[PDB]
């Protein structure tokens, strides 16, 4: 290293900070069952549904109706993000460029996991509650739980859009301490313990707007729905069983995101790269319902 400018004492120095950009909400590791896979492709075996025993005559042969099996396949895709800078930038930077690019690459992979998770979760949920405007608050969550219960599964988690959160915290059930049994939503909004303990659900996972795959982002081909809660037909929450949606993470080295800093052997470039492989799959899509505007 050879810095062109020296730093003097008593903080008479240059102003030496960077202001952060927008940071997206990261929840998929907590809001789903995580499988740390041994192979980049694989299978989860699924047993067939329960049936009813058959009425039969006395002394007649008992028919077979044994358990039968299928799989859901995972086929993890390598998400990658990289950066390259000349060594003159590293030497002359206001702050550590390698540290900043490492943090950016780590964040870009986490955002990647969350996009894969949310897009599977929203598109492949088998039930729906259409609010048609009207009773969009607690009654919609209760109704969406009803739609999953009517398929004989019990949901325990919900994933929510910013527009849906805004509607929900205006609901008189939650906004009035009389009706909520606590003033926690009025005071602390999404950080209220009741928001993670509502309609029988025991976890709330708050998403960002940009997370769902619109297909407008480069390298991504979009999902089938609109993620939102602003307009006719948007899907703005998913109510589901956390144990029945699998996020499968595969990495060839270690369990998780791999970040590699490297120097170019020829050209006085340094870079940092991140890899992870992820897939997301419902075991039972019937265990899940979207809420529609």
């Amino acid at each position: 290293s050879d810095p062109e400018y020296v730093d003097t004492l008593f903080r008479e120095q240059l102003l030496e900070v960077v202001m952060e950009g927008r940071e997206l909400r990261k929840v998929a590791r907590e809001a789903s069952n995580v499988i740390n896979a041994n192979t980049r492709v694989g299978d989860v075996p699924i047993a067939s549904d329960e049936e009813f025993a058959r009425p039969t005559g006395q002394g007649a042969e008992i028919r077979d109706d044994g358990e039968t099996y299928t799989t859901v396949a995972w086929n993890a895709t390598k998400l990658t993000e990289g950066s390259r800078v000349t060594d003159e930038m590293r030497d002359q930077a206001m702050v550590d460029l390698i540290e900043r690019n490492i943090q950016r690459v780590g964040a870009s992979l986490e955002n990647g996991i969350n996009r894969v998770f949310l897009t599977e979760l929203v598109d492949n949920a088998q039930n729906n509650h259409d609010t048609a405007g009207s009773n969009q608050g607690y009654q919609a969550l209760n109704s969406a739980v009803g739609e999953v219960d009517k398929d004989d599964f019990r949901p325990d988690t919900y994933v929510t859009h910013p527009d849906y959160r805004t509607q929900l915290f205006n609901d008189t059930n939650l906004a009035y301490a009389n009706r909520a049994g606590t003033n926690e939503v009025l005071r602390n909004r999404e950080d209220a313990p009741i928001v993670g303990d509502i309609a029988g659900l025991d976890m709330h996972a708050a998403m960002s707007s940009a997370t769902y795959d619109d297909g407008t982002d480069i390298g991504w081909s979009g999902g089938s729905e609109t993620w939102g809660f602003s307009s006719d037909g948007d899907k703005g929450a998913v109510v589901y069983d956390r144990d029945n949606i699998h996020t499968i993470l595969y990495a060839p080295n270690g369990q998780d995101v791999e970040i590699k800093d490297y120097e170019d052997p020829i050209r006085d470039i340094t870079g940092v790269n991140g890899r992870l492989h992820v897939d997301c799959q419902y075991s039972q899509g019937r265990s899940s319902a979207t809420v529609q505007y």
Partner: protein, 82 residues
């Protein structure tokens, strides 16, 4: 890939700050073409620095031809009523 001159990287270069600080301190007017190289105007994005001569100390230091009273070198922005 990014280079120190590449447009998205300029705010991270210590030298881009330091030279914009110099440009503000050495100018007498917003007329960059008269006072700086085309290379400096481009390299340091001097169009976007608030260069106007208001930060140059010589805008405020007195420099009269004859100095009977030791008035030369006094800076108006250091006086009691400033």
């Amino acid at each position: 890939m990014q280079l120190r001159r590449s447009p998205g990287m300029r705010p991270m270069d210590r030298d881009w700050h330091q030279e914009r600080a110099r440009a503000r301190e050495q100018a007498y007017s917003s007329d960059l073409t008269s006072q700086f190289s085309e290379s400096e105007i481009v390299k340091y994005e001097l169009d976007t620095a608030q260069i106007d001569g208001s930060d140059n100390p010589r805008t405020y230091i007195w420099n009269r031809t004859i100095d009977l009273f030791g008035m030369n070198g006094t800076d108006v922005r250091e006086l009691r009523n400033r």
